[PDB]
Amino acid sequence: ITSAAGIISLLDEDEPQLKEFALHKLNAVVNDFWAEISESVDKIEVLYEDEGFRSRQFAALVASKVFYHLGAFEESLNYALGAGDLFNVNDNSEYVETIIAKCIDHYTKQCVENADLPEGEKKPIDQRLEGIVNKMFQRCLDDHKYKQAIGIALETRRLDVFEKTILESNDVPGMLAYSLKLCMSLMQNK
Amino acid sequence: DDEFEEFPAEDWAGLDEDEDAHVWEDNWDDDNVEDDFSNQLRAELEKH
């Protein structure tokens, strides 16, 4: 409550138990002190960079949360990717939703850029971003909303997941008709 | 209108009547308490 200065202070002390206590308390109180944390966020960055640490994922998550509060969405996305499974994709929180949207858009743009290039120069895509988008595809399939999965598959140029969603469904002929209509309707790239 | 209710108007507890309410021009230098420029000049002449 108020201040939120001692928690930040207890981060340079060389003891990876006080460090973890401070990180957990900051994660608890990040939504109300992002401004205070932002000045010292470099400490969490160096903690994440250090491989010797054990709560690297948690440091990444807290840094990503403060950066997302600031507005540096690219940095927040990068640190969320680094945060590993601690980012709970199946969680109904504003931070989760906004970062998920950012990853989806980033992957869409990168895939569209790569598509119109020879296989030699295809720019690499981060496997963590790929995994997040795949998890979202799987959530769509689980919830049975196959049309949304088809749409994002086409947008991201994932013909594999497009085919999988078409086949694994309850109305194969209807999905085929829907996809053919999308193709002979607003889909311009020949 | 956006009446600033948060900031209260100054209380009218005392609300003393205007002392003189003269409306000429105010001006800062009037506050100074001088010493009768006539007397000043007399002293200057006396002391040379």
Binding site: - | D2, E3, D31
Partner: protein
């Protein structure tokens, strides 16, 4: 006898409210969110002229559908005292009555009710109704709804502040500010930033306020009133810290942007802070503001303080401070006045620099009633480093020489000033041409 006048006043108020909801519906239908601002304009007058009969008739006529909110609202209202000439005000007719009302309209009616409850010295139910409204707003997601939610936020914070529970609403405000920033809502951003700054300043969390100000970018397309509030609070923060020049600039802008006729209390507060910060900087505030009828009695202690500062006399300054000690504490400038009480000499050095082109340190000491010229030399050096005076000291002879006045016109500065103003004028013209509407094709 006045009962008939009150009844006809209530009828005309009902007609005004019906026009307001019609305007909101037209805004939503036409996809022109800015229309709802027309209805929101009359919020203070409507709050002033609201009455029990007005509220009860309005809710009955406007909540035919979705009667859950009627159930939650009506018990707070008082039943009409055996009304017999009731006209059963029925604005929604047939299909309109059957259909569920719009979220913006429901929010507006809830806002009216909470304002009335607040005006009446009954704050618990005001808080309850406010929390219900905020839950509804959070559940919903629209543009005009956000425009209404701005004022809803303002009055929610107001009721909590009345309750003396401003701390608990801080997290609520922060969460809503984050949602608004993500959704690109300038009005909500501005209102929430102003309310958060007020929250912090109430408890004196100046570091937190400064950090939030630094890390958040105020919306440029904000109402002039929100701009005035933001400028005042930022000037307060900068004045509490040692940024007197920026504080004076921002607060002059705030007073300039405040509404001309109303906002008397805000004007008094900004004026007092401006007086104190100007005295700290070493200038002399203009005397015209000290005789305005509205700001006359309030600023008398500050008038005496300025008098003493100009004719620097620690006896008079201490007398004034001892007399009006409590009012400075009440108004929130006692600490700044305490700083002034020890940096008073700055004004004297400024007057000496303004008057004399080259004066000896002994003469400066004599004029400033100081001790041996060493103290005067140290004070002058401090002022020169601080930038209060453009002068250079020279002890090989023992005098302070004021710097020359440069020909500003030959410099490129006039070009920069005129370019700024030209760009501003061109932007004004472009936006004033884009504001035009030609409606016949509707």
């Amino acid at each position: 006898a006045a009962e008939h006048s009150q009844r006809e006043l209530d009828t005309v108020t009902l007609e005004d409210i019906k026009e307001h909801v019609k305007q909101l519906e037209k805004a939503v239908s036409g996809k022109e969110p800015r229309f709802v601002l027309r209805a929101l304009r009359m919020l203070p007058s409507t709050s002033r002229r609201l009455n029990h009969y007005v509220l009860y008739k309005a809710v009955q006529g406007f909540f035919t559908s979705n009667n859950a909110t009627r159930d939650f609202l009506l018990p707070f209202l008082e039943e009409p005292m055996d009304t017999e000439a009731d006209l059963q005000f029925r604005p929604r007719t047939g299909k309109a009555a059957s259909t569920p009302l719009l979220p913006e309209v429901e929010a507006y009616l809830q806002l009216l009710v909470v304002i009335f409850m607040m005006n009446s010295k009954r704050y618990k139910e005001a808080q309850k109704i406010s929390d219900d409204l905020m839950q509804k707003i959070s559940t919903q997601n629209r543009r005009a709804l956000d425009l209404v939610a701005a004022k809803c936020y303002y009055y929610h914070a107001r009721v909590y502040e009345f309750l003396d529970k401003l701390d608990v609403v801080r997290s609520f405000l922060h969460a809503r500010l984050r949602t608004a920033t993500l959704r690109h809502d300038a009005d909500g951003q501005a209102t929430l930033l102003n309310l958060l700054l007020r929250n912090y300043l109430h408890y004196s969390l100046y570091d937190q306020a400064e950090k939030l100000v630094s890390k958040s970018v105020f919306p440029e397309q904000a109402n002039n009133n929100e701009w005035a509030r933001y400028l005042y609070y930022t000037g307060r923060i900068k004045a509490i810290q040692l940024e007197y020049s920026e504080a004076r600039r921002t607060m002059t802008n705030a007073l300039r942007k405040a509404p001309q006729h109303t906002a008397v209390g805000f004007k008094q507060t900004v004026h007092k802070l401006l007086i104190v910060v100007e005295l700290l900087l070493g200038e002399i505030p203009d005397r015209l503001q000290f005789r305005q009828p509205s700001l006359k009695r309030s600023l008398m202690p500050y008038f005496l303080l300025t008098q003493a500062v100009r004719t620097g006399n620690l006896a008079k300054f201490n007398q004034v401070l001892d007399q009006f000690g409590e009012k400075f504490q009440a108004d929130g400038t006692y600490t700044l006045i305490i700083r002034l009480r020890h940096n008073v000499i700055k004004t004297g050095v400024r007057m000496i620099s303004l008057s004399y082109s080259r004066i000896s340190l002994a003469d400066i000491a004599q004029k400033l009633q100081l001790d041996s010229p060493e103290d005067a030399e140290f004070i002058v050096a401090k002022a020169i480093r601080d930038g209060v005076i453009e002068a250079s000291i020279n002890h090989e002879k023992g005098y302070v020489q004021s710097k020359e006045m440069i020909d500003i016109y030959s410099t490129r500065e006039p070009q920069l000033a005129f370019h700024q103003r030209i760009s501003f004028c061109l932007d004004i013209h472009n936006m004033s041409v884009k504001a035009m509407r030609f409606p016949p094709k509707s």
